[PDB]
Amino acid sequence: DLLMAQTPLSLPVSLGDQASISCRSSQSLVHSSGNTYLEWYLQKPGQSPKLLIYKISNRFSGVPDRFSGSGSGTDFTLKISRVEAEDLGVYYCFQTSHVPPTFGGGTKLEIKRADAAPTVSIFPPSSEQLTSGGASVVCFLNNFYPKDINVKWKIDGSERQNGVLNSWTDQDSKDSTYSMSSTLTLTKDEYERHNSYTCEATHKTSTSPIVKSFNRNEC
């Protein structure tokens, strides 16, 4: 079938700098009419996809000049001449010159900004939970950059991996950082047999651990 390959898969770039994303098809996108029906879309985090370019190089309504599309045959390129923080998200190419219409797999554009240390907060299980037979401790690690982070849990000084679930946001437009949550879930029974609970992180900006802790008896 007609397949479309995007590269790179992820594209780290600094503000005001240039980025180029490429899309390659497995056969010529030149339609039997001589036309080429290649489009580009941007999906910003939490939004629907947005049309940027159609028919290789025409810019859709409200799309700035610093986006531009070019190419021919089997090779196409979208260029952002001067990257703004708002250009963050996943860029997709799309063809409808040949059956069936197919999208590329997407290129994530990452904004390369200054290092940013996480704000770490730890949240003891609400007493509202505990009747359920379980206890969930939450740790937020917010607004850090780069994304590389080492998070551990300790319980009375001993590390704990069993029961830990992590989730991380996409880069945020407003400040170009990542956030992460980490949640340690135990049975109520085990929760009550330990006293000290600790979330700690190390990051580019802090090699000695950032440590937030609480005691189960404190209020």
Partner: protein
């Protein structure tokens, strides 16, 4: 001003059926080709179906032909997708989009989520996250709401009905045991809480549940 608003998403059994709709306004709907496009759990986009402005001609991705029917109501400006013989493949966020011939998918709705699964609908348990062993560094306070053990996606989380959005992070749900769990965090000035109400608003449309949870300080 151009608007496309989808609905009808939710949980459906494997081999079951569903109807999505898409209400359009602020353009002449009946003179546009309209499309359905889906986004898979791996974030890939797949074109699903297209219908001509009058409804006369329809085209489908091969894997849905004979299973899905696209149709439209040009009097009321509603695009429909009837889906049968659903499969795990069909789990996706479904967008309606205006298709301007060869000039692109120009306008997209917000999407309605379809989960094909034999697991059961479960509304979320919502617990407050009030900070412990803290009081440090800057002059902000971080609060949250744990939204635990629900099925299917999605939930919507706001804080004070949207007023507090600028300090908000909602984390992606992690799936543990045919149940999802997320947290949402809000960071506000130390002056505004606990002196003022901060409330997370959780909606889970699959279970027709809304939950409001005021975050009140921990004490002894």
């Amino acid at each position: 001003e151009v608007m496309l608003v989808e609905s009808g998403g939710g949980l459906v059994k494997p081999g079951g059926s569903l109807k999505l709709s898409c209400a359009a306004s602020e353009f002449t709907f009946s003179t546009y080709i309209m499309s359905w496009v889906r986004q898979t759990p791996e974030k890939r986009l797949e074109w699903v179906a297209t219908i001509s402005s009058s409804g006369t001609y329809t085209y489908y991705r091969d894997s849905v032909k004979g299973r899905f029917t696209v149709s439209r109501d040009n009097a009321n400006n509603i695009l429909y997708l009837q889906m049968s013989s659903l499969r795990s493949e069909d789990t996706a966020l479904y967008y309606c989009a205006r298709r301007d011939y060869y000039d692109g998918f120009t306008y997209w709705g917000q999407g309605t989520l379809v989960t094909v699964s034999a697991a059961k609908t479960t509304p979320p348990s919502v617990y407050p996250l009030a900070p412990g062993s803290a009081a440090q560094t800057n002059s902000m306070v971080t609060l949250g709401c744990l939204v635990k053990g629900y099925f299917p996606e999605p939930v919507t989380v706001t804080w004070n009905s949207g007023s507090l959005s600028s300090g908000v992070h909602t984390f992606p749900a992690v799936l543990q045991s045919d149940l999802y769990t997320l947290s949402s965090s809000v960071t506000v000035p130390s002056s505004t809480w606990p002196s003022e109400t901060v409330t997370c608003n959780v909606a889970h449309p699959a279970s027709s549940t809304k939950v409001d949870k005021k975050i009140v300080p921990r004490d002894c």
